[PDB]
Amino acid sequence: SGYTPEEKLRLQQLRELRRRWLKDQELSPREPVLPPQRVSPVERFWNKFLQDGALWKNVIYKTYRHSIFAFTHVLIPVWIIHYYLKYHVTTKPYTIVEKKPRIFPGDTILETGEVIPPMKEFPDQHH
Template sequence: MTGYTPNEKLQLCALQHCWLKDQELSPREPVLPPPKLRPVASFWEHFLQPGSVAAADFQAVQMKPKVFPGVRILETGEIIPPMEEEPTGHH
């Protein structure tokens, strides 16, 4: 007798279906180890993490507003004069 019986064919089909379903990846897969960082990259990676001393210092720095000619300084009321033109003579 050659070949599979109808019952064996059903079992093989079911096994193949289960095997194919097991090959599908879940949203959590693949699970990869975190990448290894070189020392300098590792330093910068952790430099401004929340809770670090550098992050606290960085958060305390405030940017000064840009000042252009004609802008009024709020604290003093002074108006920034226009820039003087450079002399056109040769150096």
């Protein structure tokens, strides 16, 4: 059942071509030939500063990355939202409805100073 002499010859003829083909599918040291991609001043400055390991200046670098992220993603949006909610949404009826705060027996109200009676005495229990 093994390969006939012609079958095995053809495989070797092709097997040499495929190995040659797969060898051609390799990138030369220059490739890919990227265009003259300029680098912004921030990019180049950090590269020099990040040359040495200097663990002490990587926490600072991490802080800088998070500081910028926390500014353009958590601080500017909240300004826009707070400005939006405070001066456009809250100016219309029932746009923002908050459940009334729970009042417990024996509290003090900030709006009027009312002091609700504490409670009726309990039939003291144990356990």
